[PDB]
Ligand SMILES: CN1CCN(c2ncccc2F)CC1=O
Ligand SMILES: [Zn+2]
């Protein structure tokens with residue numbers, strides 16, 4: 245019930261063109277042996293090179309699509325393709341590299357995986373659409389053995405070096421030549437009818453097939469991502485903290501209280517329609533406004549049609565007051581809205597590439613977010629930075645260099661000079677806002693929003 249048993253059956257139909265005459269009855273134990281790996285009954289935390297769908301989902305940050313195409317079987321050169329976009333050519337003697345021997349190819353494989361995964365995961369998961377040559381070629385760049393630790397640190401071992409007989413994690417594997425103890429999963433064992441391209445092209449129109457191994461590796465991991473995260477959503481799975489997850493979420497909550505609290509003071513809306521997370525709370529609990537909630541889970545597939553969220557017959561008058569769409573992804577936002585929308589294009593360790601232009605955002609939980617579409621925001625404008633505070637000016641306590649800013653909306657700045665307390669709070673809030681923007685989130689607001697209306701709240 246925890247791992248994939250080596251005695252589970254492996255459907256070999258998808259392997260009989262590269263491997264003609266392959267037995268119909270086959271288990272993982274025989275398949276691993278067939279690949280050139282003697283497991284020799286080793287109870288050292290590595291029960292099987294292959295894993296379950298649930299284990300692959302728990303370790304999605306490790307997924308690397310892998311495909312091998314025959315450029316002509318120890319006679320023919322192989323094209324090794326990865327979801328990173330790399331194409332290596334191995335000779336037995338998008339990045340498309342020329343034909344080189346296995347000893348140099350295996351060195352580049354360790355470099356590529358270590359640079360790709362060092363800040364993502366403690367392992368690699370080869371996501372396959374197994375036809376034969378990828379499983380047979382693994383003996384040339386993979387060495388297996390008991391679970392281990394890094395020679396330079398305490399992280400688990402993910403690489404091996406024959407030159408120095410030592411093991412290393414993804415950070416200390418410079419010059420290492422073997423992938424040590426990788427994991428893998430064959431998507432073809434999930435019961436797909438038809439080939440990779442047909443199943444991929446059913447959900448994703450963003451990846452095309454140039455017939456190169458990398459294109460297939462991308463389509464494989466994409467289709468695996470769709471199956472596990474787009475159409476199957478398991479928000480119960482927690483994920484390790486691998487970066488600024490805590491500061492990003494703290495920043496978002498701070499920005500959220502700030503933007504909503506200020507909009508309510510500037511335009512004095514009677515009602516706020518909060519559309520999104522069914523578990524969300526009032527971000528501004530002391531606000532005068534009538535707060536109404538609408539439940540809508542994170543749409544993993546496509547953005548919600550505003551016509552299905554509001555219409556079809558709650559105040560029902562969504563045009564009265566302001567709508568708050570905090571991370572609720574809709575096709576076109578109404579003009580009376582405050583919106584936080586995650587930009588799927590952002591380059592970060594928390595954002596993994598998704599399906600159909602979307603992205604898998606892993607921050608405590610995995611959220612496949614649909615593609616960012618700038619046209620969702622035609623009735624709105626980008627929210628400009630500001631810091632508002634109605635709190636008393638009282639230091640209570642962080643050194644000081646006089647703060648002079650137009651965007652620090654406080655009583656002290658109204659009356660001339662900014663005080664030390666609001667000056668610390670301004671720089672802390674500025675850092676949180678910067679944290680939030682860089683983490684790929686974008687803020688938008690109704691066109692009539694003006695920060696000038698906030699000075700009046702000081703009388
Ligand atoms: C749980 N886990 C997965 C991710 N992981 C790392 N992530 C980022 C940087 C360095 C790492 F070792 C290693 C680990 O212990
Ligand atoms: Zn290490």
Ligand SMILES: [Zn+2]
Pocket residue numbers: 444448449450451462463466467599600
């Ligand atoms: Zn795709």
Ligand SMILES: [Zn+2]
Pocket residue numbers: 636637638654655656657662663664665666
């Ligand atoms: Zn002040």
